[PDB]
């Protein structure tokens, strides 16, 4: 109740501007900060918050003591902006970390080429299925069968080629498992099955 | 030979 | 009753282990509410209540004021402590120790009066054996004139011949003070 | 007094109130008054004789109190004229030394938990007001921001002469009298 | 910056643990925080000038200490299963600062039993010829499977140099038995290179999974190898 941030995850397309909001209850609160925390890692101070409007590059943080609102603005969001953003409020002898708003920036796949490929083990029968090159608006559903595993979406960035691509991996120990039937709960009608 | 003091600050 | 509006400003220094630990706390108080505080451990003004938030923010925005307050623990507290080492911290006033019986004979009052500084240890002994049960002491009493006093009562049932000793240790004493009260009859 | 230390000092205690209007400037070391500045007379009055070797420009006190006057005006407005609350003082009378009839002694009247710092302390002997041989401390600070004050009465204790410390304070319904007999 | 040790640790319920934090050189305030999923950052205590300045609401079995060089230690005398968390220390020049510098944390997993600890098996799957033809790109997939707890760090090494470009590792592992809380984990990663780069048989591709398991002081009486801290890897070279 002391520090309240926007709850749900923000799913934002690359290039969009993002607005984080946060409210604090104690009018006597003196100092305000935004922190950034990547998954399973540590928080890092992003910027201090002022009424005039602190602006550092693509980031803008502002404080409104009348409404007791704190804001963070991210212009031209990049994939590397994906993290949890913590609203941190300092009062007399109490520093309160908000629970955070998670941000997931998805890439804008210009020319989708969705396909499902089978990949063989380098050291000898075992194989995995790679659903790749699909579009950021495509969701992947974790399998509900105990014998076939399906990972979430994953965005890789071939920097030297300015090429981003989505992919998901599926495998199974069952011999009846085939890549054609692998991604059946998660699919586009243009998906290539070589 | 002189004690020092802390100076009060105006509120504006 | 008339209405009164009170402002207090306290520039306080804390010292422990000589000057090993020195701490400055500046306090701005409206009536009896502390609203703004500068704690040299913190290094900036902090609003204790909403009433002190504008002042805390205003003073903190002034670089020259902040740096002056950050140096004040060394400039004020440490300078004045050196003066205290030559004066207040050298003050040694030996206690006057006095025994007088009372009744509620069944009560001995050891009056330890006019000593400085406050650190003192007072013990009761009955025939060279320290009494611990039946000892009732007042709190340390600040006379306000840079001396203290304290009263230490001993509940007693005296046998004729018993010697009751009041044992007083004080930094002004190279050796403890002992005053004796010897029972001349059995109570 | 939550902060624990070997020694605590106030350099200094700055007080200003609307009633009067009056101010007070003192320094305190381990709870005792080192000196006060007479703001009306612009004089530094040392309370411990060994401290008289020092010099303390009483103008620094006047400058500080003037800042308190300014700040107090701002806070009366900002708090919507929130005035002080009268506390009930506690009064205790006792002698500096063990009482011996005919031997010089000092009566001590401690008025504790004073707020606001506006008090009357008067000594009585058989209803008559005693003025000779009476002195008192300034308002001495407490960590809860109330005050205490100690009045003294030098005397020769006699078998048929008793005394009363009379204290008047807005937090009291009636003047409080604390009797002392030898 | 801030140095925390140990970085990973497996203890059992009822055991004691001591975590260490070296603040940024010159900093005097060290704070400890507990990071759990679903609760966020929880304040343990702050140390300044070798004494505890502030304290959170944690039970008495959580205790701390600060030495004269401002290094700080945190101790739990009797661990509970619910104490599993990332324990973070933060340093600031002065006390009670809102601008904190965090270490990378100590990842403490508290278990009822060490018979549940397993290192990962790592396999590298070579790119599909179909992908190399249809896209002129080659994706290697790395699978780390059957490890517990979630104490792994996966990295890709090409010709002896760790690469990051064209790599995607699952931010969270899959549970091989999604109901059990002692379930072993699986983790996948992809490394995508140009088709030309893969078709050079002199290029060396290695998937490297650092596992943090049991210490030397931990007792082990099972038949299988003691699941100690180790690196498990798999590799591929590329065909014509
Ligand atoms: C003061 O010094 C003594 C050793 O003489 C030590 O035991 C104590 O902890 C010290 N106190 C502080 C606050 O440093
Ligand atoms: C003190 O006595 C004077 C004179 O009678 C009176 O005017 C004043 O109100 C008294 N102050 C208090 C606090 O009773």
Numbering used by the authors:
A (entry chain D): 2 to 29, 36 to 58, 63 to 65, 67 to 68, 74 to 141, 143 to 204, 206 to 213
B (entry chain C): -1 to 10
C (entry chain B): 3 to 106, 112 to 194
D (entry chain A): 1 to 11, 11A, 12 to 54, 56 to 182
E (entry chain E): 3 to 29, 37 to 58, 63 to 72, 74 to 81, 83 to 255
Quoted from the paper:
The crystal structures of the TRAV12-1+-TRBV5-1+G9 TCR complexed with HLA-DQ2.5glia-ω1, HLA-DQ2.5CLIP(ATPLLMQALPMGA), and HLA-DQ2.2glutL1(QPPASEQEQPVLP), uncover a reproducible and unanticipated binding mode of TCR-pMHC, whereby the G9 TCR binds at the β1 of HLA-DQ2, away from the peptide binding cleft. The G9 TCR revealed a comparable affinity for HLA-DQ2.5 (DQA1*05:01/DQB1*02:01) bound to glia-α1, −α2, −ω1, −ω2, or CLIP, with a KD of ~7–14 µM. Alignment of three complexes on Cα backbone of HLA-DQ2.5glia−ω1 complex revealed a highly conserved pattern of G9 TCR CDR loops and HLA-DQ2 recognition, with a root mean square deviation (r.m.s.d) value of 0.13 Å and 0.35 Å for HLA-DQ2.5CLIP complex, and DQ2.2glutL1 complex, respectively. Despite relatively low sequence identity of glia−ω1 and CLIP (27%) or glutL1 (36%) peptides, the binding register of the peptide bound to HLA-DQ2 was conserved. To characterise the energetic basis for the TRAV12-1+-TRBV5-1+ usage of G9 TCR, we generated fifteen single site alanine-scanning mutations on the TCR based on the crystal structures and analysed their impact in binding HLA-DQ2.5 presenting CLIP or glia-ω1 peptide or HLA-DQ2.2 presenting glutL1 peptide using SPR. The pattern of effects of the mutants was consistent across all three peptide epitopes, in line with the peptide-independent mode of recognition.
The crystal structures of TCR-HLA-DQ2.5-peptide complexes show that the G9 TCR binds HLA-DQ2.5 in a reversed docking topology without contacting the peptide, with the TCR contacting the β1 region of HLA-DQ2.5 and distal from the peptide antigen binding cleft. Consistent with the functional assays, the interactions of the G9 TCR and HLA-DQ2.5 precludes CD4 binding, thereby impeding T cell activation.
